Symmetry: C3
Subunit: 193 residues, 3 copies
């Protein structure tokens, strides 16, 4: 790993913290879409994309890769990752604070695993997916590409979620899909005074 | 930090554990409202208030402060706190086991952050609030003073909760307030045999 | 503790990881019901039962015990356990990644505490119960024997759950029982396109 890091990017601050938690001494913030074609003249420190938004993550990932930078994973030192889990190497993957990834799970490329999320044994988490704060996937769950799992959501064991799907905050997925969809919980209801 | 600690106070036991996890060698239990005016004759070891109940916490906090004691924070050594987060110094704040507080969050004075709760980047948590076990605040959430977030509850990003509000166990807050209120989830329903 | 471990048993892989996280150097997988009466001829390394299923756990536990093996607890080194908590010694108890067990809680014999679950102060968790991923018991909760708490479920403080009960994924228990029962949450609802 390099000693400084370029961070492209609120989610930028959190990525700075994870980078500094790993050995990084200096974070360099860039947030310039159009200046990106010139950035190839810069010293090749490690890069990270602190977006988003799957899908700007993905676009900018591709532009930065094609400009000769290495886009590393940021994994905080708190995360517990089984030696048999597969985390795509140098793939712009963010692994928060207190994440757990258990035996033979697979995390692909530019996934976000947000703080205290749990990926159980034998999960796949597809490319450019966002598993948010405290979201939990039970054993053998298959999350497709460009999915969003909202805060405190969960997925029961052995289930698949199709590409481009949204699981709302506090929702529990109970059924296999193959078709993309959106997947809401209950709403705290104000009690009337 | 002092070597012994006075603990005013079930929540008392848990506070004893956190104090001992930090370097404290001896915990001294007091639970005497009326004897408190005499306690000023005692050796000034660090103090902690292991109530409650916001609001007895607050009252007793004020009486103990005015009697010449320092009321410290108890932060277990498991908690992960961003160097840019603000935790009010010496302010009777309890931070449990596996709590995470991310970049630029603010925790004020006599807050309880119970075990495995998560305070995301740029939260405020107002004075004498109780964020209970496994409760999670997404980025930029504003919790008012004397609020209660029930077990396994969550608040979606960018939302504010007004002073004196209650979020029930397992509930998800989805909407801005400014008015105080109470904010219930669903009830596991016994299936009939 | 012995240097190798027999593991009887997906949940087997996860148990291998916990054993290796503790000092174990080699895991030996057995999954032979009928060959078990001969296994008494083997070297008496530590044993663990990586089932299940309460209740095969229990049956096989009893057969392996009667064959002269010690069935140890597997506790990952991440788990935080109050010095005043009681974890039944050498009792086939699995304690995952990021579990917290607070002051004066009791964990009996062949319980599963799955990853990031939380057992608050003064809980009992009865024999051969399964507290699953991210499930949380508030203070003074009594879980009976052979109970199942589903993923991301919770139990409010001071409540009892009777023997042989099931709490569904994402459900919140709000009421005392004494009678066994089953105890469902809400279902993420696909929104229609």
């Amino acid at each position: 790993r390099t000693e400084k890091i370029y961070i492209y990017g609120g989610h930028g601050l959190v990525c700075e913290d994870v980078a500094k938690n790993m050995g990084y001494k200096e974070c360099i913030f860039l947030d310039d879409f159009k200046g990106m074609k010139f950035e190839s003249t810069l010293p090749k420190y490690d890069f990270f994309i602190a977006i988003g938004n799957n899908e700007i993550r993905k676009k900018i990932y591709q532009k930065i890769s094609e400009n000769g930078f290495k886009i590393v994973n940021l994994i905080h030192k708190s995360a517990l990752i089984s030696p048999s889990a597969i985390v795509e190497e140098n793939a712009g993957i963010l692994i928060m604070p207190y994440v757990v990834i258990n035996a033979k799970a697979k995390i692909e490329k530019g996934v976000i695993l947000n703080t205290s999320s749990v990926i159980e044994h034998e999960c796949v988490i597809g490319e450019f997916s966002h598993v948010s704060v405290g979201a939990k996937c039970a054993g053998n769950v298959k999350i497709g590409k460009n999915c969003f799992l909202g805060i405190n959501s969960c997925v029961l064991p052995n289930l698949s979620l199709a590409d481009d799907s949204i699981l709302g905050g506090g929702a529990t997925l109970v059924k296999n899909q193959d078709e993309k969809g959106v997947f809401v919980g209950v709403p705290a209801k104000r009690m009337e005074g």
